[PDB]
Symmetry: D2
Subunit: 115 residues, 4 copies
């Protein structure tokens, strides 16, 4: 599991469950090609997005549909989503955990890059 997305709801202090997450790889022509997606689970985590073979170096965008999450909860959000764009380098072995800490008018996203 080279890439795991973790989403936390900073309003309820809970994992942000059932949050749509799309991953995209930047194609040569600078457009985003859908690559992987899922919904975060009960634990706010989205595993099994990609695999080691698939997850090659490149520029990836993780788009977290924070807005539907806030809509589902009835809280007016500021952002359309949360959108983590980063270069997977893979110079040494890497797991990437992208943790998005979400508030209606603020989000934080952190990469915990290990191995």
């Amino acid at each position: 599991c080279p890439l795991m997305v973790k989403v936390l709801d900073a309003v309820r202090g809970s994992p942000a469950i059932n949050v749509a997450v799309h991953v995209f790889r930047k194609a040569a022509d600078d457009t985003w090609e859908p690559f992987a997606s899922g919904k975060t689970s009960e634990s706010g985590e989205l595993h099994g997005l990609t695999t080691e073979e698939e997850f090659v170096e490149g520029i990836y965008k993780v788009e977290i549909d924070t807005k539907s999450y806030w809509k589902a909860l009835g809280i007016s959000p500021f952002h359309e989503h949360a959108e983590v764009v980063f270069t997977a380098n893979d110079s040494g072995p890497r797991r990437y955990t992208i943790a998005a800490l979400l508030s209606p008018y603020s989000y934080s996203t952190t990469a915990v890059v290990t191995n």
Copy 2:
């Protein structure tokens, strides 16, 4: 100004100065049209990106070039940028301050939205 971007360096506890900021607006055909861009100043602020006439409703994307920032300070950061995509002025004109707090592997983007 209706749109202000502020950027802090959470490593140096400083304003993040000379950070490139690009603002786009989603056009009718769902492309991003270049809307405005600028550098944060010596206070980490980027004022005057736009005006209350120009800053109509729409979805805007603010791409703060955090990578060049960290790179110029010798850091290889995780993200290519800090993004902020939001619907602006949906229930009439607002002032938006987008505050981006930057660390090499984490950033936070907050909006202070006030009713002028």
Copy 3:
């Protein structure tokens, strides 16, 4: 002023107004002496807590009463407060802006430290 506290409500995307802020300084005997306190204003800022004469080196604690804040808005928040403990003016006088970004279960405290 050498010490400014700014507090944002990340739920409402607003300044967090009328937030009680208490500043303490660690005395010789390692107790916290009350140093200064105030409310954030209508801009979420608390200026004039102290002066450059009064704001000597030491360890200071800033306790931002985030709980009363969230409680007055009907929210049961997680933390009793947002704290900031820091050594101030160790290598001469600095201006400190403490920016506290508040959510009911998360807060972030950042310092913008500039050399006047």
Copy 4:
């Protein structure tokens, strides 16, 4: 495991390993009584701090020695520590994860409160 502290280093995008964490319970006289402590592990996590029986309602302070962590890395930090003070309520069953996302001049701390 009613209370788990997770510390992330936002500069290196790694778990913050070997970070001293002290937990205190507010005593009746308003002083902090040491209750539990540990060092975060390799995964940035500090488990086994307390137990269900021990972790009664009360006001707790989690003090994270962020400053020694930054010193160990040679980066001048702003804060003396990170200090999470909160009321354990236990109205329904709760695990508390206190995640501290640490930068030299910024920290974020979030409670993920589940069950």
